[model samples]
Target: SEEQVAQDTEEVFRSYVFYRHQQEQEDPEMVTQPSSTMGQVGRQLAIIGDDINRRYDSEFQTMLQHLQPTAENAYEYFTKIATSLFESGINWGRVVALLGFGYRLALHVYQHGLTGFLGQVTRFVVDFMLHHSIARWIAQRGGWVAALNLGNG
Candidate 1:
């Protein structure tokens, strides 16, 4: 279920690449109840996304713009962010931020129309699922459904 959940969420990340969405506008306020896609957890995820983009978004862009979007480069970017996010402990908001980082790349490539970069970006999603402790965190909570319902608790 974790791999399935990760892959399913990865699909959401890839959709934004060509599909496109405005960034800066997502951060309105604190998400007391998530407001997800399937449950406002989807919306909550986007809200946290703004946090990542709005959080240290410039840092991500600065780091990314300095490097080419090769597979290795992007993995480092995700690895960097994932490690940073875990500086404290695993939280669902941070999990969403991991996804948020990928969305940032997705939008980045879309802006440049980088076709080859697409797979590289997606490659990170797999790693994000398997490579990081975030999956274990997700599993501990309750897959993405628990992620969405965090506010309810």
Candidate 2:
């Protein structure tokens, strides 16, 4: 049931979250991608996110208008989002956009001035990623060492 709950959460997240430089929005100890390319993929992810957002912003805001994030719901919510990304076509740009979408939600918290919101958003964005199908798919493939396979990279 809890697993299913996570699934449901991810669905909601997609409606909220990715590309870069056209828009707005990491981890440690875990290592970058942990499968390949070191963390450089993460850096690229950061760089391209603006393009992702510029493209996807309207959908993200629309999703937010529907589903809201809580400290507890945030984690499971993003895992599903990541799963959605995996199913789509994973790219550094897309991945970064997901994080940015999550970032927007979190910062929305700050604007509301909710206490402890930062910590929850951070945890949800950071740690929440490691456990879900997203990680499994990442590990199954090649991690973000992916540009090599991305064709355009």
Candidate 3:
């Protein structure tokens, strides 16, 4: 059972990587089909309709609704998590930023001996700062209030 689960997990991730690569090659703007892995994972989870979907969809949808980059049924798209995973990739900035941090942290690890811990802290700090900035901007930005009023709208 454990091995089967691991195999499925890896397969799901593999599907996602290829799916993202395909989407990037085919549709950078997401005007076309979502990546292949994303759909597979989502359908699998939805089919089971297990505790995961029931327990996590609320928070998942909150983050997802913010990410709907296209006109496709965005909400429904995110509610299906596995599908999203298959198709997800780092945006250019995220890729660069992550790489930069990794490089810096490699230096830090070599110097500090504890290795990599500082990178985790840096990531946390970046996440906090970004979240706070977005929160503040959304609170004050005109018309965004209406955007939030969207009732799963």
Candidates' C-alpha lDDT:
0.58, 0.54, 0.43
1-153: candidate 2 lDDT, tens digit per residue: 988846544433332231121134211111211223323443455464455555766786677657666655667877887788779688855655665656566654444444365787887866756766666677678786874777674
Q: After superposing candidate 2, which stretches have Cα over 4 Å from the reference?
A: 1-48, 113-153
Residue 128 of model 2 has an lDDT of 59
lDDT of 3 by residue, 18-111 (tens): 3433432422222223335545873443344334334643664464346432323323533454344435675643432332222222223343
Which candidate do you rate higher for TM-score, 1 or 3?
Answer: 1
Per-residue alpha-carbon lDDT of candidate 1 for residues 8-117, written as tens digits (9 for 90 to 100) = 66445443322224445341111112113534345445644554356576687887677656444566666776798899999876776666667666556545555365
> Order the candidates by TM-score, highest first — what do you get?
1, 2, 3
Error of 1 at 147 (Å): 61
lDDT of 2 at 144: 67
Q: Looking at candidate 1, what is the lDDT of residue 76?
A: 65
- All candidates: CA RMSD (Å): 20.7, 21.4, 20.4
Please identify model 3 stretches exceeding 4 Å from their true place. 26-39, 42-153
Residue-pair clashes per prediction, in order, are: 8, 12, 5
Who is ahead in TM-score, 1 or 2?
1
TM-score winner: 1
Candidate closest to the true structure, highest lDDT: 1
